[PDB]
Scaffold this active site. Structure first.
Site, PDB file in Angstrom:
ATOM      1  N   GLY A  67       0.862  -1.145   0.000  1.00  0.00           N
ATOM      2  CA  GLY A  67       0.000   0.000   0.000  1.00  0.00           C
ATOM      3  C   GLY A  67       0.912   1.211   0.000  1.00  0.00           C
ATOM      4  N   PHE A  68       0.548   2.210   0.759  1.00  0.00           N
ATOM      5  CA  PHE A  68       1.207   3.524   0.657  1.00  0.00           C
ATOM      6  C   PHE A  68       2.392   3.526   1.653  1.00  0.00           C
ATOM      7  CE2 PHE A  68       0.795   8.196   2.082  1.00  0.00           C
ATOM      8  CZ  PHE A  68       1.498   8.693   0.887  1.00  0.00           C
ATOM      9  N   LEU A  69       3.584   3.672   1.078  1.00  0.00           N
ATOM     10  CA  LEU A  69       4.786   3.810   1.804  1.00  0.00           C
ATOM     11  C   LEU A  69       5.046   2.730   2.847  1.00  0.00           C
ATOM     12  CD1 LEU A  69       4.807   7.791   2.187  1.00  0.00           C
ATOM     13  CD2 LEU A  69       6.558   6.395   0.856  1.00  0.00           C
TER      14      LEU A  69
END
Ligand SMILES: [Cu+2]
Ligand SMILES: [Cu+2]
EC number: 1.4.9.1
Lengths: 125, 105, 382, 381, 125, 105
Positions: free
Chosen positions: C74-76
């Site tokens: 997912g995100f970062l």
């Protein structure tokens, strides 16, 4: 390379887009993400449905039916991208159509596109 | 549940006994749209063409789970024995437009 | 698109194998592969994808230069890899509608051969620190049973995740410190605003016991966001913007400060040489060596790629080698086996260059590693 | 580095920002709104080569300026209200990036705040996941119903009430494909046998499906991207060789026009064929057909094209042939008085904006994602 | 295009990375996504918090304080990427740290990075 | 809830009073980190440096939602009226190392 010229099969390198079994591939070669010519990478789910195409094998002169089963349940590999279309028909002939995500039948109802494999069903016909 | 599977894998057309309920597959079509069989009867689908095909009953049709049959290459066959009266729809997994019905009496 | 040498030979032996099978009439029977068993030359490359909502990790055999798998995030996300090869994991963040909607932060643990998730542990109240990826912002304890991750907002804290029981435990309040270097199931160190380290030691319940050290650097000496830490050695290797290197020895669970060392000579510094990139530093445990990415650069260009690696003896620190890498390199690491590989990842080329660490010679490469690959992680299995 | 319109635009913007500061007027940051939907607004959809998340670009076709962006999921189907009052898409997400629980949904967006005003879940994952074909998801002419295609487990068309913000139902339909709506309750599809379906659906009950005559042979291949003007009611369908099938449906029934070739006989023997993605545009005011074309092998039909021929729809007379100057994959037009031609390059990730009558390149917009393929215009006036 | 050279500010194009206000920008310029220099694109959420750096204006030769607030709740725009680090300090000095996603206090709790705006909030020296 | 907000968004420093109860912000610090005040009292933060700062009270401190105050540029102030006895912790949104505490008697 000239994009518009007749596509010319080779039988020397499966990670290349002119590899003979890839005559009607759309997407990415599974061999480039931990799969093989005919097998899915770990973690991905193997579709049982596919578009097909007869591709010419320059090695033995025979035509074989290739089943473009997708490996699914992962974001696109982004490695070794190819788009060939030998005998490829529009969507009302889905059996020969390659823009379709051919994930049906994959374990766990995986329907996302990761990569495509290039197994021989059988022959000539 | 409503059917048993005689053989998990596809087998060779040559294998199928002489008096036998057979559905041929050719030219992107099941031979019969609607097959009428009695309870306890075995239906065998036979693929006659090079295009791979199967028979797929959605979840809840033949039982709780989908019955997704194996892909059949040219001259391969696949059987189901129907153990309960009812009407049961099916399709070809890559070809939704190929549709059939088994009517079991 | 445009193949490396390794690719060609693998693609060629693959086309020869498959031709031989066909000539033998062996039917193609598609199945799902397992990856080879984790070994010392397995390397993981994480692609933060320049802040994209979804990201990829590439599992690579560094010996062959082959992609053997991949894991979505997912995100970062923050990846971690168990030293003993038994599992990999990440803290990750997803959104119900791509990049908006409800946020879910979670830990996933994966089997390192099937790459299947074996745990999925949700983190309450979206506590992850959304930052460009710093390996030591999420960290395994030495027995692997626990993962620790940092929260920045609304207050500094460290989340405790029990990997063994597949459960989130609790947030620990901690001082104004940053990064997490575990030394045991319930002890880890962090780096503070005032230039001390904090030792953080936590019970089953209740507030942790905190023990600061001396300030070990001035306020105008900048310690990079990517120090190297060998959990097994307990060696924390911390460069500043000028390539001075702080070594802290955490092996006893108490900070012993080691003599400071300059990675760059006096003359090199006068000439404009400074560390630069992302994972600027690596540490080989058995050899007790430090590898630093350096170039000639202005002082506010400290995130740019570098073309050189200096290698130094950590005990002395005598310079042992200086290599010209032949590419714009953002990140380095090493394998931890006898005759290590030196990994050099270019974010701009999206390519992992694999080098002989001893001679610095480029051996092979793996391209097409996502959109902006930045982080290299290895297991120290020895 | 940059374009070209973007330098002149970034410099205009830099002059005016150095002017606000020379006057000592404070920066007061807030959220902009796009200009009102005009005749030349262009949408560029990035299916991102089958990535799990995708992006739409909203462009000032006149200034060559990105006026905004819409996030999407896996292979979403964009639609734009002809009358410019909203945009929508049918999209797909998953609970863990590309796996776990699937959610298919429709979002409707305000065309100036670009905010979502409805989020409408579709039960049972019914969207057809395929490289993006604009006429697989389609607005009814009155704009209160979205119709999308389902391929598997059986062909079906889904009915989504945008006015009421609720999914209605799945229509069982025959072995046909694509969705060209003619009435708030009627639409056409194209069939495996070669016919058309007329589907007229009515709140509950079986829909009334009638068949047309088979209108092409089995070995004549009609492309995945026919152009369709819902206002005019003309569906222009190119084949892999340039033959154009037109069907007039503006009366709620199918009147097949006489067959037309977009290539001289000379060109076909010289190897010329149409190829690319959105190969055919159709202009409505001007009854024109634009066709991406080039020299190729028969079966290189998804490759980019460097030429576009123009032609009058009634006559089949060549009116024009432009050298496009790039690898072009997708063509569209504005539907206004003097029209822009759009030339999307998937490889350059760039939309080239051409003068419709001369064929000349006017400006460019680059960095349009990873693999931009799908150009959509609102036919307003 | 010598990545390692000293920064050289320009006051004539806000969509190039060497534009004078972008001296510690990390991400994408909002103007290339339907924002402007100091405004968020439509549909996005405007952060309140941020990292700062002092940037020299070659026009009226003063330095001015930039607040690099992010526009959030959208996937990264992918247009006009820049990374400059003039005065950028590690994470333990967050006020000046630019790897941090600066999205706190955005409407709707939006935390995904779309693009950064370059508004002046005053002046250092 | 447990307090109320004068301005929603901040104001010039001038608009003050004199002898108004104030908390200065300079050098990355709230200069009175433990303010003791009485019910009904209005605390004003004043930003003294170019670095933006605010005050931020978590969820369940001033009432069920968190008060995320707005950023004060150099020499803006913002205020809050306390309306109930108890201790309220805050911090600055970009700078969570900057912590204070209003004690209301
Ligand atoms: Cu079939
Ligand atoms: Cu502050």
């Amino acid at each position: 390379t000239d994009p518009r010229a007749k596509w010319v099969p080779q039988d020397n390198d499966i990670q290349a887009c002119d590899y003979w079994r890839h005559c009607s591939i759309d997407g990415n070669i599974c061999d480039c993400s931990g799969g093989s010519l005919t097998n899915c990478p770990p973690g991905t789910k193997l579709a049982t449905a596919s578009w097909v195409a007869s591709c010419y094998n320059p090695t033995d002169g025979q035509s074989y039916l290739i089943a473009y089963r997708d490996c699914c349940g992962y974001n696109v590999s982004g490695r070794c991208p190819c788009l060939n279309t030998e005998g490829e028909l529009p969507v009302y002939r889905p059996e020969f159509a390659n823009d379709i995500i051919w994930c049906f039948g994959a374990e766990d109802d995986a329907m996302t596109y990761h990569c495509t494999i290039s197994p021989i069903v059988g022959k000539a016909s | 549940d409503k059917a048993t599977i005689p053989s998990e894998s596809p087998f060779a057309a040559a294998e199928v006994a002489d008096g036998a309920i057979v559905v041929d597959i050719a030219k992107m079509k099941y031979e019969t749209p609607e097959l009428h069989v009695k309870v306890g009867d075995t239906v065998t689908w036979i693929n006659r063409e090079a295009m791979p095909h199967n028979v797929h009953f959605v979840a809840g049709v033949l039982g709780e789970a989908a019955l997704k049959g194996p892909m059949m290459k040219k001259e391969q066959a696949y059987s189901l024995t129907f153990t309960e009266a009812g009407t049961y729809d099916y399709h070809c997994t890559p070809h939704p437009f190929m549709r059939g019905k088994v009517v079991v009496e | 698109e445009a193949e490396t040498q390794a690719q060609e030979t693998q693609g060629q032996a693959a086309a020869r194998a498959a031709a031989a099978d066909l000539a033998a009439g062996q039917d193609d029977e598609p199945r799902i592969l397992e990856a080879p068993a984790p070994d010392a030359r397995r390397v993981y490359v994480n692609d933060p994808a320049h802040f994209a909502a979804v990201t990829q990790q590439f599992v690579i055999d560094g010996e062959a230069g082959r992609v053997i798998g991949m894991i979505d995030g997912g995100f970062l996300p923050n990846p971690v890899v168990a030293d003993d090869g038994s599992f990999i994991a990440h803290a990750s963040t997803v959104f119900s509608r791509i990049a908006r909607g409800e946020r879910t932060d979670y830990v996933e643990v994966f089997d390192p051969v099937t790459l299947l998730p074996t745990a999925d542990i949700e983190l309450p109240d979206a506590p992850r620190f959304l930052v460009g990826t710093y390996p030591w912002m999420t960290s395994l304890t030495p027995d692997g049973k626990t993962l620790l991750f940092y929260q920045f907002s609304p207050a500094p804290a460290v989340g405790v995740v029990d990997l063994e029981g597949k459960a989130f435990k609790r947030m620990l309040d901690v001082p104004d410190c940053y990064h997490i270097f575990p030394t045991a199931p319930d002890t880890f160190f962090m780096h503070c605003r005032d230039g001390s380290l904090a030792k953080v030691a936590f019970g089953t319940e209740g507030t942790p016991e905190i023990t600061h050290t001396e300030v070990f650097h001035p306020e105008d000496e900048f310690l990079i966001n990517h120090p190297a830490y060998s959990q097994k050695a307990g060696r924390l290797v911390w460069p500043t913007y000028t390539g001075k290197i702080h070594q802290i020895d955490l092996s006893s669970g108490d900070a012993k400060f080691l003599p400071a060392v300059e990675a760059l000579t006096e003359a090199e510094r006068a000439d404009g040489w400074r560390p630069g990139g992302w994972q600027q530093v690596a540490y080989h445990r058995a050899l007790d060596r430090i590898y630093l990415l350096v170039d000639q650069r202005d002082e506010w260009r400290h995130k740019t790629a570098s073309r050189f690696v200096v290698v130094l003896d950590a005990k002395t620190g005598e310079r042992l080698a200086k290599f010209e890498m032949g590419h714009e390199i953002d990140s380095i690491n090493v394998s931890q086996d006898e005759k290590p590989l030196l990994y050099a990842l270019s974010t701009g080329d999206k390519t992992l260059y694999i080098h002989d660490a001893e001679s610095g010679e480029e051996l092979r490469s793996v391209n097409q590693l996502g959109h902006g690959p930045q982080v290299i992680t290895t297991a120290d299995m020895g």
